[PDB]
Amino acid sequence: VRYSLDPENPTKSCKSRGSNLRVHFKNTRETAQAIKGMHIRKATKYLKDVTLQKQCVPFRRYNGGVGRCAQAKQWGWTQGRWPKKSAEFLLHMLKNAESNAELKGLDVDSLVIEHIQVNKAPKMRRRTYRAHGRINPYMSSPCHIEMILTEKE
Amino acid sequence: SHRKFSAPRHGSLGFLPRKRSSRHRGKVKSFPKDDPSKPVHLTAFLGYKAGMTHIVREVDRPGSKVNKKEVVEAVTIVETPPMVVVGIVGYVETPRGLRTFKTVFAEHISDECKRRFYKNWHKSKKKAFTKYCKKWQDDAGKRQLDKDFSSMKKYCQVIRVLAHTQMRLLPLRQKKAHLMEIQVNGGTVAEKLDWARERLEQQVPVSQVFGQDEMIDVIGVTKGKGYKGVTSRWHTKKLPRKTHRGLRKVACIGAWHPARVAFSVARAGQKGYHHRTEINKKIYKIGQGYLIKDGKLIKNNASTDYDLSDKSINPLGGFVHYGEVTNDFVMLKGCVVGTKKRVLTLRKSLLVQTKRRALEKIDLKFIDTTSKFGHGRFQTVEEKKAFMGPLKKD
Amino acid sequence: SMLRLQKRLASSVLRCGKKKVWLDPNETNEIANANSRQQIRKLIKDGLIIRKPVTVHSRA
Amino acid sequence: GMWRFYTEDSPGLKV
RNA sequence: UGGAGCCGCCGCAGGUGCAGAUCUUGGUGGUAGUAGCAAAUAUUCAAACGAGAACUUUGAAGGCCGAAGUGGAGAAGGGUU
RNA sequence: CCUCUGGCAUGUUGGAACAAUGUAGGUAAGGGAAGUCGGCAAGCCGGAUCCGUAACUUCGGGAUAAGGAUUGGCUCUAAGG
RNA sequence: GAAUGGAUGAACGAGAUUCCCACUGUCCCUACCUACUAUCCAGCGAAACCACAGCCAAGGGAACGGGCUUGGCGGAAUCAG
RNA sequence: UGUUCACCCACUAAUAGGGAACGUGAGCUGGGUUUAGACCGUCGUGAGACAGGUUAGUUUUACCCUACUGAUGAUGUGUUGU
Ligand SMILES: [Mg+2]
Ligand SMILES: [Mg+2]
Ligand SMILES: [Mg+2]
Ligand SMILES: [Mg+2]
Ligand SMILES: [Mg+2]
Ligand SMILES: [Mg+2]
Ligand SMILES: [Mg+2]
Ligand SMILES: [Mg+2]
Ligand SMILES: [Mg+2]
Ligand SMILES: [Mg+2]
Ligand SMILES: [Mg+2]
Ligand SMILES: [Mg+2]
Ligand SMILES: [Mg+2]
Ligand SMILES: [Mg+2]
Ligand SMILES: [Mg+2]
Ligand SMILES: [Mg+2]
Ligand SMILES: [Mg+2]
Ligand SMILES: [Mg+2]
Ligand SMILES: [Mg+2]
Ligand SMILES: [Mg+2]
Ligand SMILES: [Mg+2]
Ligand SMILES: [Mg+2]
Ligand SMILES: [Mg+2]
Ligand SMILES: [Mg+2]
Ligand SMILES: [Mg+2]
Ligand SMILES: [Mg+2]
Ligand SMILES: [Mg+2]
Ligand SMILES: [Mg+2]
């Protein structure tokens, strides 16, 4: 398929996407901003730290009510969280793009995450029963992720 | 309409932003006015709140019902091991204010002091004042040093010494010794500066600053109490039992029509850990620390002319949440700001003291030395060993 | 692996609660392929599933 | 929709 | 971009031009990763399975319902649970 | 209220903290309703045995009126078939 | 004001008052403790409301302005209240 | 006394007077006014009436913006600490 923002030198730029993933769009977005521009081996480390809370993902855009944390000071920011599902869902994606580099025949530990982008995916809906017999929505806001790595060292 | 029944308002506005103090070490916001006439001296000291206790004393205010009657009296022990002067720092008057002009540091500086200059000492290579101290042993540096001191002689007006604590000698956890600027108040600036230039790298004990029966101002940070509601933080009335949305509140924040809530209205926020300068705390006892001529001299602390035992101010089982006061200490009347272990600035008074009460000579009759770690009933361990007799642990 | 069925059948064979059914946790897999009763009655006789004793309530 | 008030409460009562 | 029809002029005809109607139907935001997932005392250790275990299962312990039961059976109602 | 038989996994989640406000419990020196529209709320009282029981009365009641004392553990005695 | 019933009245009342005894955090005057919250985190995740928006003083003005006039002034993004 | 108001006792230095949407109900309370239930008086043929008396009667929502309270931070100074 067409990715937004096609690569500069396709020769040496592996690809990935994962469509229609049950991962909070907003959390997935912030952790995708965090990861962006990293060398793939750093990125992986960074997400496993986020998984165990040794580093945070600063929640910059979608930061309404999100707590402060000392770990955010690394990023130059006050907010920050440890979104685990998001890190588990773009550690799989990284795995796949790394897969495809290896298949394509690129140096895997020269790969920079050049482009990554979280879109909203069509919403699910299940209901929540409310006071005075009102029935409100209770909808997941899943996300399409996609990304592009590149040989840069 | 007017408020029906008048009442004075809760809390003082002369104390607010009721926020958590930036500093931990309480700043001396004003040193006394150096008359140029009396000889040079230090105006301030830096102690530590070790703990409270009793005293007993004959009082001599004639007229009172308590004249020639032994009262008891609470007191704070401020353990005050001698400070080390490691600097001077010249100031000059301007119409803008009082600009710092030139800071000359000493040659050798302790790791007690050097600690302060790094946020993480474990991780540092401890490289501070390293290229500085090169100055103190050559022709070039020593000359520049002298020219700096000369310039300060020409230009400066206020001179403050920089000293720091001897964190080494305390029962506290921390090693990072508190520095502080202390002002030299006395004769002419050239005399004033050559005094502090002589004192450089040297000890300064408490008795050199203060004397007995002297009113001094304690400066420190208050014992902090976190987020607190308006009823705690402002001592507002509680509302009654029936109040539906809670009752440790203020009911009417404000009127409608200055349509903003005013700065004078009581709100919940930080209670405690404020900076506060309590004044007129009379020194009952400047106490000599433990020392050795052949054996220990532990007596010299809490023994009085009338008691004559072998105590120190340390109670049985020590001062609680603190340690042993093994160093020289002052003994103020009454409570003072802050917690146990808190660093505490003393300061000579801003004020011409000439009240009957402020010139009163204190002869102590008896220092209570019973444990504070429970209801104590024995003044010393030897007394306890006498009273009890032998125990199964023998 | 999953022995809620074997505990039910065992209980019904023993005519006890299923509190009182004890399945040997070491020999689990043998119990797992017990599906029928009479397979279970066999395991009752072999001593892999056993009726526990009553919790003692002394009258003393 | 949201309940808000009872029938005999009729919020802003000004008789 | 798309992939099969469409327009100019002269006449005739009309269910012919929207920002509003607490307008109708459909969709989407900010609010917000916020409120919230607090009734009824309680969980812990090891193992098994398994890609994966705070939650499954087994064993061990600690707890509750305390025979007006959180037990054992029906009526009505459900309709394959 | 505690237990066996039988039954459950704390009622749609977990973890870390222990701030203000709350919801639900408790306790408070001296005073004792001064609080408030109003003793609202909570507190006192409480079982049993033994005494003792007013006004009034439709003579039945009032009446657990009020007001008092005792109560455990242990070792015996006497009395009831 | 006399079966539109008048006067009475023991017993009874989750009925309306007043006083006394007791008792108490109702109060003087507030304080400390416990549990569940709120708090921070993982997972999950609504709603009302919404012309645009959101610092003030005064003026005039449909005679009480966030916006206008004249002044004061104005510093990202946020957290708990 | 629901009261505003009023009056009385007591203390006191003094027990001055007002304003802020007759300040202040997403601050309370709800005693009183002011639904529906009922009683009494007067009025009405009556249904009903009464600034005439009585008793019983659901007091919702803040997570938005501001304001205030406290809490991280912000631009600058080359970075950092004092
Ligand atoms: Mg619901
Ligand atoms: Mg319903
Ligand atoms: Mg006044
Ligand atoms: Mg209420
Ligand atoms: Mg003590
Ligand atoms: Mg076609
Ligand atoms: Mg038509
Ligand atoms: Mg339209
Ligand atoms: Mg939450
Ligand atoms: Mg059954
Ligand atoms: Mg529970
Ligand atoms: Mg559970
Ligand atoms: Mg349930
Ligand atoms: Mg009390
Ligand atoms: Mg009163
Ligand atoms: Mg009263
Ligand atoms: Mg009551
Ligand atoms: Mg009676
Ligand atoms: Mg008549
Ligand atoms: Mg008649
Ligand atoms: Mg009549
Ligand atoms: Mg407006
Ligand atoms: Mg008003
Ligand atoms: Mg209001
Ligand atoms: Mg209200
Ligand atoms: Mg009422
Ligand atoms: Mg009515
Ligand atoms: Mg919140």
Task: Give A12-70 as a DSSP string.
Answer: G--EEEEEEE-S-HHHHHHHHHHHTT-BHHHHHHHHHHHHHTSS-B---SS-TTPPB-G
Give the determination technique.
cryo-EM
Sorted by sequence, the CB contacts under 8 Å of residue A41 that are 6+ apart come out as A109
Q: For residues B104 and B373, what is the distance between their CA atoms, to the nearest angstrom?
A: 47
Number of CB atoms found within 10 A of residue B232's CB: 15
The DSSP element (H or E) to which A148 belongs, if any, is strand A143-151
Q: For residues C39 and C51, what is the distance between their CA atoms, to the nearest angstrom?
A: 16
Contact B/C (≥3 CB pairs under 8 Å): no
Tell whether the torsion through CA atoms of B208, B211, B216 and B219 is positive or negative: positive
Burial class (CB in 10 A: 0-12, 13-18, 19+), B59: middle
Sorted by sequence, the CB contacts under 8 Å of residue A61 that are 6+ apart come out as A29, A30
Q: Which nucleotides of F are covered by protein (CB under 7 A)?
A: 3-8, 19-23, 35, 38, 40-41
Sorted by sequence, the CB contacts under 8 Å of residue B159 that are 6+ apart come out as B88, B89, B90, B91, B152, B183, B184, B189, B192, B193, B196
Q: Which residue, B201, B200, B191, B181, is CA-closest to B89?
A: B181
Q: Let me know how long chain B is.
A: 394
Q: For residues B347 and B159, what is the distance between their CA atoms, to the nearest angstrom?
A: 16
D1 to chain A, closest Cα gap in Å: 7
Which residue in D has a C-alpha nearest to residue A135's C-alpha? Answer: D1
Contact D/A (≥3 CB pairs under 8 Å): yes
Note the CA–C1' distance, A63 to E9, in angstroms.
Answer: 63
Report how many helices (DSSP H) and strands (DSSP E) chain C contains, helices first: 3, 2
D5 to chain A, closest Cα gap in Å: 12
Q: For residues B249 and B267, what is the distance between their CA atoms, to the nearest angstrom?
A: 8
Across the interface, whether the CB atoms of D1 and A134 are under 8 A apart is answered yes
Tell me how far apart the 2 most distant CA atoms of chain B are, in Å: 83
Which residue in D has a C-alpha nearest to residue A136's C-alpha? Answer: D1
Q: Spell B163-185 as b/e; 16+ CB within 10 A means b.
A: bbbbbeebbeeeebbbbbbbbbb
Note the CA–C1' distance, B202 to H20, in angstroms.
Answer: 64
Distances (CA, A) of B327 to A60, B78, B314, B332: 53, 10, 11, 16
Which residue in D has a C-alpha nearest to residue A132's C-alpha? Answer: D3
Q: Spell B114-124 as b/e; 16+ CB within 10 A means b.
A: bbbeeeeeeee
Amino acid code (one letter) for B128: A
Sorted by sequence, the CB contacts under 8 Å of residue C10 that are 6+ apart come out as C18, C21, C23, C40, C43, C44, C49
Q: Match 């020194």 to its residue by tokens.
A: B283
A123 to chain D, closest Cα gap in Å: 24
> Chain D residues with CB inside 8 Å of A131's CB?
3
The resolution in Å comes to 3.5
| Ligand 14 center to B239 CA (angstroms) | 19
Q: Is the CB of C25 under 7 A from strand E?
A: yes
Strands B215-221 and B227-228 come out as unpaired
| Ligand 16 center to B245 CA (angstroms) | 26
> Chain A residues with CB inside 8 Å of D5's CB?
none
| Ligand 11 center to B160 CA (angstroms) | 64
Q: Is some CB atom of chain D closer than 8 A to the CB atom of A131?
A: yes
Burial class (CB in 10 A: 0-12, 13-18, 19+), B228: middle
Q: Quick one: how far is CA C5 from the chain centroid?
A: 10
- Cβ(B107)–Cβ(B136) below 8 Å: yes
- With breaks defined as C to next N over 2.5 Å, after which residues does chain B break? none
D7: its two tokens: 């029938």
